[PDB]
Design a protein around this ligand. Structure first.
Ligand SMILES: CC(=O)Nc1ccncc1C
Lengths: 39, 156
């Protein structure tokens, strides 16, 4: 039995931690909703 | 149950203790999450029940109580924020410049941020605070790191 619990408001935060890169990837999406890399 | 707009954890007591299986968005009386988080099962909110209304395994999305309401899109240029809600941890905003998933059916924004599987369904926001998609369906690249699509549904 699944249940939900509130975790916060949805708002943009100024001075949030800025991280992560921006990779451009060739991908395929199958009928089961799974992404895979195309190489 | 609680119907206030915001971000919510999706929990289960079926396993050991209380386990966070994912996250979702409550907006305009509709609960939005990824299909792989709930597998389309009913949800509880206090004494109330949330029944699935729309879902699609290939998009990996599901809405409860009403049709999908989120329709903002990444502009293809600006940084966005993942409002990550990790299991047992406080909601935290992380800013990033999305990359791209190139597919035979068009291009999709992608966020190269690595969080536990139970963080799936956390919202990705633009600078106006609008939800442009949900985090949690992606791929594991060469170096073992995780890259999620910015998955968004259609507002009918
Ligand atoms: C199934 C899924 O999306 N899980 C995952 C795997 C590895 N790293 C992060 C995440 C969110």
């Amino acid at each position: 039995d699944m249940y939900i619990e509130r975790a916060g408001d949805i708002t943009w935060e100024k001075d949030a931690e800025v991280t992560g890169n921006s990779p451009r990837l060739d991908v395929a999406l199958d009928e089961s909703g799974d992404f895979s890399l195309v190489e | 149950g609680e119907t206030t707009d915001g971000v919510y954890r999706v929990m289960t007591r079926r396993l050991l203790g209380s386990t966070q299986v994912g996250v979702g968005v409550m907006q305009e009386g509709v609960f939005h999450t990824m299909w792989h988080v709930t597998k389309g099962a009913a949800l509880r909110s206090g004494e109330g029940r949330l029944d699935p209304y729309w879902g699609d395994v290939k998009q990996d999305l599901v809405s409860y109580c009403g049709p999908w309401k989120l329709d903002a899109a990444w502009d293809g240029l600006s940084e966005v924020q993942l409002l990550a809600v990790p299991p047992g941890e406080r909601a935290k905003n992380i800013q990033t410049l999305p990359g791209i998933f190139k597919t035979k059916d068009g291009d999709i924004g992608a966020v190269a941020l690595d969080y536990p599987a139970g963080t799936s369904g956390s919202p990705i926001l633009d600078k106006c605070g609008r939800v442009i998609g949900l985090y949690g369906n992606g791929v594991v690249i060469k170096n073992g790191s995780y890259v999620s699509a910015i998955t968004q549904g259609k507002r009918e």
